[PDB]
Design a protein around this ligand. Structure first.
Ligand SMILES: C[C@H](CCC(=O)NCCC[N+](C)(C)CCCS(=O)(=O)[O-])[C@H]1CC[C@H]2[C@@H]3[C@H](O)C[C@@H]4C[C@H](O)CC[C@]4(C)[C@H]3C[C@H](O)[C@]12C
Ligand SMILES: C[C@H](CCC(=O)NCCC[N+](C)(C)CCCS(=O)(=O)[O-])[C@H]1CC[C@H]2[C@@H]3[C@H](O)C[C@@H]4C[C@H](O)CC[C@]4(C)[C@H]3C[C@H](O)[C@]12C
Ligand SMILES: C[C@H](CCC(=O)NCCC[N+](C)(C)CCCS(=O)(=O)[O-])[C@H]1CC[C@H]2[C@@H]3[C@H](O)C[C@@H]4C[C@H](O)CC[C@]4(C)[C@H]3C[C@H](O)[C@]12C
Lengths: 286, 294
């Protein structure tokens, strides 16, 4: 299909499937997702779906996985996604334990900047897990599934393995308990847990008793290990505020004492330019 | 030979810390007699002992210390100072079994059935000596160089999650996707049926390339599990489908048993039971007693 030469099938689900591919014009590893078109169009959120996908198509951030192309047929939608080869960020933990504070703060800086930027373009992840933190060959963080995470659950089951150690930890209490919730505050909770794990080497909420586990999460009862600095612990407790109404904002995190150390904000540009054929994103075109 | 600038417990010389949790650590170590490399888990003794399940913990760790199964991570020795317990465990270097799936997708029916056979034999073997895993997950399915499955954390999984946490994101996960609904419901009395369900989910992943129950929405995830709501991909043979539905039965009472799985026609294909010699020495009660070593 088009610019892309197909490789093996990575995953094959009921309403979606994923194939390996390369760009015959530049040599880039990509993946291509193919999903049932009417499954998306039927969905109640379609107007938001179209808007977020349209936006992500345009977004170029050095720490966000590129969505190169969105194409449709009469029955399918095709997403072409950047494929990186550095593996998962959490691989570093499984093999050498906790990261040093300065290395954890760096990846956190890249994550907070990428997430914040997507938010400022009106795109919220809402399902941020360690498996979305990828690395490129040069060890730069690449966050996946912005925009795609908006898709209905049945096309999110694309035949690939999605497994997370300690799933409930990454889900904010309001997302666990309520139908609706603030996207930015939910993503920030996930980011906060991700930082805890990077710096501690283990999850902040552990308990074999599920009732005790979820009680802990709803009161944000957890303990920072003794090697966390005073300033790192203060930031993590404001981020892992169980009330989304009082939880710190992204702007306040970016202005925080600890976060600013060694923080040189990334310099990049994008236009590309914005969204004037939005409702036709999934329109058939050979 | 020995290194004067390193600590030393028994014939083992301790090297550096791989992972650190609140109460447990994992260190590299070396058998100074024959040069074997091992991992040693070190845990606060008092924290282990102050637990109403300490009796079960001593039995399972005593059993595990004696079992030699080709598909189980070996526990060579257990030693104790006055304030620490040292669990001496074997290494593997073949990574995690779900690496194959994660980077390269599902496996063919023959090779997934092979891996399933190893899992089932290892788990059935441990069960029949009275050890139940109860936390089977991908982080416990390791491979060696021969690409043979080695199940980790038998015995150790009897320790409380927060005590055995070693800061490596392996031993303590608490991921509902692999947990039987009666366990989730705090009614998982039958340890063997609960382990079988996790084995069924693991098989499904090998043959499908993905989890049978999954959802970004936690409410929906738990509902799928309780109802055992899933579907097999169309490339599953009829018998495989039939076996997987018998395992992923949300009622443990009618769920198929381990013995029935072992005599199952689909399971039996290419199946070669592990030939190996099989005791009970000596003092279960003393498993954590001060060994009297540096
Ligand atoms: C899971 C793999 C990572 C490969 C890997 O595995 N690399 C490390 C090797 C080391 N091993 C694991 C072998 C040993 C470590 C043992 S351990 O088990 O501890 O890991 C990563 C690398 C590239 C990723 C895809 C692309 O972005 C495109 C696309 C973006 C969407 O948004 C989501 C879907 C999709 C298809 C992505 C899915 C997935 O996310 C991929 C396949
Ligand atoms: C906190 C939530 C609240 C329920 C809920 O669902 N709250 C509204 C959310 C709406 N949704 C997010 C579903 C969106 C719907 C959009 S829709 O498109 O569907 O319209 C509920 C739902 C499922 C509950 C757990 C399970 O019981 C399993 C388990 C039973 C044991 O005893 C121990 C306790 C435990 C861990 C429970 C904890 C907790 O109590 C959970 C997470
Ligand atoms: C995860 C790390 C190793 C990281 C690693 O080695 N990562 C794979 C990279 C290399 N690869 C395999 C990808 C190359 C393949 C090339 S190929 O071309 O073949 O694909 C491994 C190495 C040693 C392992 C521990 C010991 O067991 C002791 C102990 C046993 C008990 O029961 C409880 C668990 C515990 C703590 C174990 C946990 C974990 O399991 C450890 C830390």
């Amino acid at each position: 299909v088009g610019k892309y030469e197909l490789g093996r099938t990575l995953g094959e689900g009921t309403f979606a499937k994923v194939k390996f591919a390369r760009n015959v014009e530049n040599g880039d590893n990509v993946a291509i997702k193919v999903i049932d078109k009417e499954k998306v169009l039927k969905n109640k959120m379609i107007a938001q779906i179209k808007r977020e996908i349209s936006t992500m198509k345009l977004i170029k951030h050095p720490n966000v996985i590129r969505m190169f192309e969105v194409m449709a047929s009469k029955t399918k939608i095709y997403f072409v996604l950047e494929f990186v080869t550095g593996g998962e960020l959490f691989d570093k933990i499984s093999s050498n334990g906790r990261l040093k504070e300065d290395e954890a703060r760096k990846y956190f800086q890249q994550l907070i900047n990428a997430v914040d930027y997507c938010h400022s373009r009106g795109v919220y992840h809402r399902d941020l897990k360690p498996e979305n933190l990828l690395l490129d060959a040069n060890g730069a963080l690449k966050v996946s599934d912005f925009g795609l995470s908006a898709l209905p659950q049945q096309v999110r089951e694309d035949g690939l393995l999605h497994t997370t150690c300690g799933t409930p930890n990454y889900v904010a209490p309001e997302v666990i308990n309520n139908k609706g919730y603030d996207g930015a505050k939910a993503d920030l909770w996930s980011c906060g847990v991700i930082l805890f794990v990077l710096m501690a080497g283990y999850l902040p909420f552990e308990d074999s008793n599920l009732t005790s586990l979820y009680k802990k999460i709803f009161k944000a009862e957890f303990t920072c290990p003794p090697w966390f600095s005073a300033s790192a612990k203060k930031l993590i407790k404001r981020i892992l505020d169980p009330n989304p109404a009082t939880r710190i904002t992204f702007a306040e995190v970016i202005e925080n004492e600890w976060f600013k150390k060694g923080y040189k904000a990334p310099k990049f540009e994008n236009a590309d330019v914005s969204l004037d054929d939005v409702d036709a994103i999934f329109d058939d075109s050979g």
